[PDB]
Symmetry: D2
């Protein structure tokens, strides 16, 4: 089947990609970076994120695999030949993780695999947080982060967020340095939203925001609304062997 | 239909219960505290918790309503006559929240509407946390809290936990004063588990634990295992009008 | 004695300043915004911060008073005539709060009354934290905040910092969204440093930083070192009546 | 000079103590556990805490040394012979850390080297926090912890407290699972108090408290007041070589 391999671009990753390409050549197994059914990323989570964003229009057609030279991998370099062989035989099942939809109105829509965050253009950050049309809080602070379940181990975690198992179709909102006093009040806790709940951020002053979607960070001017919802689209991973999310978490954070 | 009313036992709550009983007398609408289809609690969340635990064997037969003299209410005293009338007409729909199953092996099983917590008998607290048979961490600290989604606003919140919408069938584990240094390591983040994930606590030293289930707190001796799972049983509420969970959260925590 | 009055610039503050100027005219009591012995700020803490930075070269000659139209005030508008009279009689004692020295080497030196923070130019933020020449941690995250004792109620608080009584000559370092995993480690706790302890931040990648000092925020390029120490200089307040720091904290945060 | 050695009581610690006693026998250097000038603790911080509490009446006469078989040590077993020799020559300087005074009125007074905490007898915990006679907050939650500067790395840290350098004569109050909503309010931040500030805890309901002082935990009945102040007494350590507090912190928490 059709496949491609992205690389981090250092000497180790490129050489490992070339050797895999040669290994796939022994099967067949066409290399195609236009319309692949399998996308292999060799590098770190940054590389994997770039891979995902490179093919975010063909998510329903692709299964992703990651090699870690690393949360979204999966595979070590020395196991790469085993991977070539298993991938060749099609000895794998597919696992789907939920994604986050960000809509910015002035409409621009973005997909996040990890999170989408909002900060001012610098800038005291003040927004009204509206949940399913109900005014929930006026947030004052450094910014806000909306994470997918697989993103919960990333920026979310650093902000005091809960780790959520990715079989849960949800998104989680965390505060960055919220101001709380006698006058200003936020909830001061992460919030976990189900699919079909809509969280809207509305400007108070100040309509210019620095908006991130995974690695991408761009200044948006004249914003009327930032809207979050769990996406209808999912990312598919190829697997291969049991590597439970909680084991993956243990390995990345405990030992 | 059959109904009963529990009261906090102060003068305001009892008098309000008597007046409701008289109001229900005008319809019919039998009072029955043995096998009711409707349980009305007048007091605070403590009263509501007692009401739930009083009828935890007939959860699939009962719809609960709360009057707040108050997170699980619902109703103010001055609206009580409206409630009598709407309840009388059956002008209501049913909402279900998920519950937590606690199993203690030496088997004793408990249902929690809010949370189940574990602390030592005093006592350095040290347990191994096992998730679906995988050893995740050795927890050292003051204790652990496992919360339902509606419990997330209670003890969970105080411990840095996320608020979860109760349409999500999950349970959330929070740490109490975890010790983290060069030698001792916990995840240091709340964890959100889906239905059918099992979290087991296993003793390291020390087999005596103070175990709470909502209001109930009992010392357990010679414990082999404490097991958490999202219950197959649900609590049903009667509603009546739109009062969204996030609005309820706003009202209790923001203003 | 010589005095000046700064104003927030809204209609209420200007009018209140004019009336005070007229009140001081009845005594004498020269207005002098070049070399004042007394600086009155009418507005909020922003106004007070601007006032402090306007005269940071004559700190040892000035006593500051704040009117709140407000943590650094002190006075309500309706009490302004009492203030004019007490100030006129010299019926006041002086209270001194410690300040923070920031040195940026490529040397630029800054004084902070609240805090000095560091973030990347955008930018993954990674610095080595060196304490009295000992390499303490490599910090990865969003940034760092170094606060004076009176700043502890501001940005510091939002970041999980302790509130310190300003009779303690210290500075306190807080983390912004620190990354902690199996590979990356920070202390994950605020740190309180005495006078004569030096905290140095050293670049790892990346030598461009966005550095804040109270309200001022500027991008610094080609940085070799950022150095923090409790300053030898102090801010003096005029007081007037007992208004204890902990009472001030209660009033701003509790009720 | 007069000395004694406490041991953890395992085979390694006892044998190491015997060998040190023999080493000291070669000098002289009388062993005296009644009125020693030097107290050596071999074990962990628990052993060191027991050593401190064993001689808390002769603190102004004793210098403490710790051997770690370990925050309050100082020394590894393999260095013990070097210690015997340096101690013998008197090649050491003295470092003093501040302590906490706890007073319980119904007066019982306790000294803490680490912390003094308060929880209910089980028991919703509710107390009024009074600072220098001013009513600061009504605390509702699991309990409170008051830490010395050297205790800041212990229970304090686990509760989100700041690490304070022990050259600062202070005490720090941290919350255990504080309840904060629309009705109930705490400061939600650690508080750092200078010497001569008095923090008083006053019962609201409920006059029975479980009070800890380092390792000691006792139920107190019919309490009118719990009073905290930085003690006039200090603990003295013998040193020997440079081992800075921040280095000690690095070694215990970073690597
Ligand atoms: N303070 C913070 O936690 C912080 C700040 C900014 C960005 N980020 C993260 O960086 C990501 C993208 O940046 P980049 O990779 O281009 O460079 P980067 O250096 O900013 O982030 C990469 C680091 O984050 C880790 N990471 C990425 N996804 C993860 C996941 N889901 N779980 C655990 N760790 C994960 C990577 O392994 C790597 O260590 C963003 O999606 C965001 O999550 C984190
Ligand atoms: N530090 C803490 O947050 C803490 C400590 C112990 C117990 N608790 C809570 O107390 C509950 C039962 O105790 P009790 O009611 O018999 O007496 P209690 O005084 O210990 O708790 C009652 C308080 O908790 C509130 N509460 C109960 N359920 C809630 C919910 N789901 N969301 C928000 N607030 C809620 C009540 O309104 C009331 O203010 C437990 O289920 C536990 O959640 C909390
Ligand atoms: N997330 C945050 O807490 C955050 C983010 C950026 C800046 N700041 C603060 O803003 C200050 C200066 O900004 P500005 O005033 O020009 O505009 P600003 O809007 O960014 O900050 C002003 C707000 O902070 C409050 N404040 C200032 N000093 C305080 C103090 N010591 N204690 C308690 N509250 C205090 C003011 O009363 C006002 O509500 C900085 O010194 C920094 O402390 C805070
Ligand atoms: N969640 C918690 O952090 C927690 C809970 C209860 C007690 N404690 C601590 O335990 C201490 C006494 O108990 P124990 O030693 O008899 O048995 P213990 O097991 O309860 O505590 C001993 C542990 O705490 C560490 N410790 C002691 N003092 C320390 C210090 N100042 N800095 C860093 N770590 C330190 C020890 O090295 C050891 O790992 C108390 O003083 C309290 O600080 C901590």
């Amino acid at each position: 089947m059709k496949y491609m391999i992205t690389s981090k671009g250092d000497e180790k990753s490129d050489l490992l990609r070339l050797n895999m390409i040669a290994g796939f050549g022994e099967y067949d197994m066409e290399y195609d970076d236009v319309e692949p059914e399998i996308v292999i990323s060799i590098g770190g989570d940054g590389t994997f994120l770039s891979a995902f964003h490179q093919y975010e229009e063909r998510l329903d057609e692709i299964a992703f695999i990651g090699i870690h030279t690393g949360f979204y991998a999966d595979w070590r370099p020395a196991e790469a030949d085993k991977l070539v062989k298993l991938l060749a035989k099609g000895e794998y099942q597919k696992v789907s993780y939920p994604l986050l939809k960000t809509t910015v109105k002035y409409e621009a829509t973005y997909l996040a695999l990890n999170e989408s965050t909002v900060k001012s253009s610098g800038g005291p950050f003040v927004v009204d947080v509206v949940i399913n049309d109900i005014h929930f809080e006026r947030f004052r602070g450094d910014g806000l982060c909306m994470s997918t379940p697989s993103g919960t181990t990333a920026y979310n975690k650093s902000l005091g967020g809960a780790l959520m198992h990715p079989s849960i179709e949800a998104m989680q909102l965390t505060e960055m340095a919220s101001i709380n006093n006698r006058v200003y009040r936020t909830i001061g806790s992460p919030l976990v939203f189900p699919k079909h709940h809509v969280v809207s951020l509305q400007p108070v002053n100040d309509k210019d925001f620095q908006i991130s979607v995974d690695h991408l960070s761009i200044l948006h001017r004249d914003v009327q609304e930032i809207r979050y919802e769990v996406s209808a689209k999912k990312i598919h991973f190829a697997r291969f062997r049991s590597f439970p999310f909680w084991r993956r978490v243990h390995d990345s954070f405990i030992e």
